[PDB]
Scaffold this active site. Structure first.
Site: not given
Ligand SMILES: [Ca+2]
Length: 260
Positions: A124, A129
């Site tokens: 990932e 974010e």
């Protein structure tokens, strides 16, 4: 207004070689609907049938095409869950690549996300974010990577989160910003905010086979209720989800470039 092809690459990338567009992972999202061209490149779901984290419930119906944006929506799923918009690529990206999204994050407590994950959910990269509600953290590009052990679910590389302000430290929800990743090889990636370099990452792989980030990753553009937040009692209220001023994450374009 703006097409992704007219926006210059960071000088750091042009110092390294010429770059061409991977058309399968680039979109101006200027479609008026989810048409054949949209579905050739994208799926309006997560990479598998995971319904998502915390109080998230991934919803095909919470991605809209409107007025040159992909809009990532959020709605109450009664009683206490959140329908979350999510699109993911059909095609994989491998290093070396430059992956960059132009987005105006939401103002909600949900995370506004541009990330990549391998099919087998091990690898990932979090290009961005952000929690849009945060007086401080709504100003921060959030960058991270994770190598997951799947069976006894465990992050083998936790605490790699690093936050960066844009110039002047604006609230990122107030305007479109660019969130960029130069994925150089299996162990190196540079992160870029509005074309400026903010992070020179070296990946530390503690796996038995330390091959680093060597798999194809699928692109994910989503919003998520993060479990660690909703368990602390930080999750959108009904009035927040209904407030048209803060309830939507807008993606003007996404692009992925490859060396020529
Ligand atoms: Ca657009």
């Amino acid at each position: 207004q703006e097409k992704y092809k007219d926006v210059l690459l960071p000088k750091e990338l042009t110092q390294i070689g010429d770059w061409k567009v991977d058309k399968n992972l680039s979109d101006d999202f200027n479609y008026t609907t989810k048409n054949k061209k949209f579905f050739k490149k994208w799926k309006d779901s997560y990479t598998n049938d995971w319904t998502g984290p915390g109080l998230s419930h991934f919803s095909s119906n919470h991605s809209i095409l409107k007025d040159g944006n992909l809009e990532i929506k959020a709605e109450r799923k009664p009683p206490n869950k959140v329908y979350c918009g999510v699109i993911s690529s059909r095609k994989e990206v491998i290093y070396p690549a430059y992956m960059e999204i132009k987005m105006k994050i939401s103002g909600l407590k949900l995370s506004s996300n541009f990330w990549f994950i391998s099919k087998d959910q091990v690898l990932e990269i979090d290009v961005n974010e952000t929690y849009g509600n945060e007086p401080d953290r709504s100003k921060k590009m959030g960058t991270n990577y994770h190598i997951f052990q799947r069976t006894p679910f465990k992050d083998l590389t936790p605490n790699n989160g690093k936050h960066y302000t844009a110039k002047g430290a604006p609230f990122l929800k107030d305007q479109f910003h660019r969130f960029g990743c130069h994925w150089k090889d299996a162990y190196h990636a540079d992160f870029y905010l509005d074309g400026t370099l903010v992070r020179q990452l070296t990946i530390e792989d503690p796996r038995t086979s330390g091959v680093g980030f060597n798999q194809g990753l699928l692109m994910v553009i989503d919003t998520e209720d993060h479990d660690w937040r909703s368990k602390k009692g930080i999750t959108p209220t009904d009035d927040e989800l209904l407030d048209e001023t803060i309830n939507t994450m807008y993606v003007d374009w996404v692009r992925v470039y490859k060396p020529k």
